[PDB]
Scaffold this active site. Structure first.
Site, mmCIF file in Angstrom:
data_model
loop_
_atom_site.group_PDB
_atom_site.id
_atom_site.type_symbol
_atom_site.label_atom_id
_atom_site.label_comp_id
_atom_site.label_asym_id
_atom_site.label_seq_id
_atom_site.Cartn_x
_atom_site.Cartn_y
_atom_site.Cartn_z
ATOM 1 N N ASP A 29 0.865 -1.180 0.000
ATOM 2 C CA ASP A 29 0.000 0.000 0.000
ATOM 3 C C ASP A 29 0.919 1.254 0.000
ATOM 4 O O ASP A 29 2.126 1.154 0.284
ATOM 5 C CB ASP A 29 -0.909 -0.034 1.242
ATOM 6 N N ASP A 31 -0.193 5.150 1.016
ATOM 7 C CA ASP A 31 -0.440 6.077 2.113
ATOM 8 C C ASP A 31 -0.590 5.312 3.421
ATOM 9 O O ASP A 31 -1.534 4.522 3.575
ATOM 10 C CB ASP A 31 -1.699 6.894 1.825
ATOM 11 N N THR A 71 -2.862 0.967 -4.471
ATOM 12 C CA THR A 71 -3.358 2.064 -3.610
ATOM 13 C C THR A 71 -4.784 2.440 -3.989
ATOM 14 O O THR A 71 -5.079 2.656 -5.162
ATOM 15 C CB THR A 71 -2.421 3.307 -3.655
ATOM 16 N N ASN A 72 -5.657 2.552 -2.990
ATOM 17 C CA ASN A 72 -6.968 3.152 -3.168
ATOM 18 C C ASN A 72 -6.801 4.669 -3.000
ATOM 19 O O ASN A 72 -6.193 5.160 -2.053
ATOM 20 C CB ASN A 72 -7.983 2.710 -2.110
ATOM 21 N N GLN A 73 -7.347 5.415 -3.949
ATOM 22 C CA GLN A 73 -7.337 6.866 -3.966
ATOM 23 C C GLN A 73 -8.761 7.398 -4.028
ATOM 24 O O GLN A 73 -9.172 8.059 -5.010
ATOM 25 C CB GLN A 73 -6.477 7.344 -5.146
ATOM 26 N N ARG A 128 -11.047 -2.062 -6.188
ATOM 27 C CA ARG A 128 -10.946 -1.306 -4.935
ATOM 28 C C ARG A 128 -10.742 -2.306 -3.804
ATOM 29 O O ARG A 128 -11.605 -3.127 -3.537
ATOM 30 C CB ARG A 128 -12.186 -0.468 -4.655
ATOM 31 N N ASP A 154 -1.282 -0.734 6.045
ATOM 32 C CA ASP A 154 -1.715 -0.387 7.402
ATOM 33 C C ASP A 154 -3.201 -0.513 7.606
ATOM 34 O O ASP A 154 -3.703 -0.165 8.672
ATOM 35 C CB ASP A 154 -1.210 1.010 7.831
#
Length: 209
Positions: A29, A31, A71-73, A128, A154
């Protein structure tokens, strides 16, 4: 042009390292894992690396294991920013990693979110996380051995996405262990636990003999 495969999905090969087929990958991941988490990751000037992730990236790099950012944005669906901001911010993350002598090999990102406004407000899109789509797609593109791959993040959604993609282990940044048959969530809270992760990456390394 932005490497969009559809309005809410970005898929980008990074760098020009060559990977033979059927390698495991290190999925990360972004962020909260590679960079410090923030509500609105739209300003490249605010990006700061998490230095405790850098040994893992370095280890994978030296082991010849592709490093894949997934990464999910959701801020994009929510109107907080767009793909141009993602490009700037993500580029800044990769630049900071370069300055530390480490790199990644692919970036996948998914904008779709249930609380979005407008056409990107797709609530349960296969790309997602916790849906495993980005891992499965990276697998197709790099001919990965998903069953031997590892994931670090995380959020519980990262561990769920890993399990659903067919992985056997993931490391949860700042999280607790959950060791079950078929999937183990490994804790990643201190340097000893980072060692466990590094050992797991090293076992996947290439024998150049």
């Amino acid at each position: 042009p932005h490497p969009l495969t559809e309005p809410g999905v970005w898929i980008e090969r990074i760098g020009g390292r060559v990977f033979p087929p059927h390698l495991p990958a290190l999925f990360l991941d972004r962020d909260g894992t590679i960079n410090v988490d923030t509500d609105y990751p739209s300003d490249p000037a605010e990006i700061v690396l998490r230095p405790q992730m850098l040994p893992a990236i370095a280890t994978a790099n030296r082991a010849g294991i592709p490093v894949v950012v997934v990464t999910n944005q959701s801020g994009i669906a929510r109107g907080y920013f767009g793909w141009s901001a993602f490009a700037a911010v993500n580029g800044r993350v990769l630049e900071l990693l370069r300055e530390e002598g480490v790199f990644v090999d692919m970036v996948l990102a998914c904008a779709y979110h249930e609380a979005g406004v407008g056409p990107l407000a797709i609530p349960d899109h296969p790309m997602r996380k916790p849906n495993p789509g980005m891992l499965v797609e990276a697998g197709k593109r790099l001919a990965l051995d998903l069953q031997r791959s590892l994931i670090v993040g995380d959020k519980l959604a990262d561990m769920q996405a890993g399990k659903r993609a067919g992985l056997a282990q993931g490391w949860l940044v700042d999280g607790e262990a959950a060791v079950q048959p078929g999937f183990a969530i490994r804790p990643l809270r201190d340097s000893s636990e980072l060692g466990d992760l590094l050992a797991a990456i090293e076992t996947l390394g290439r024998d150049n003999r």
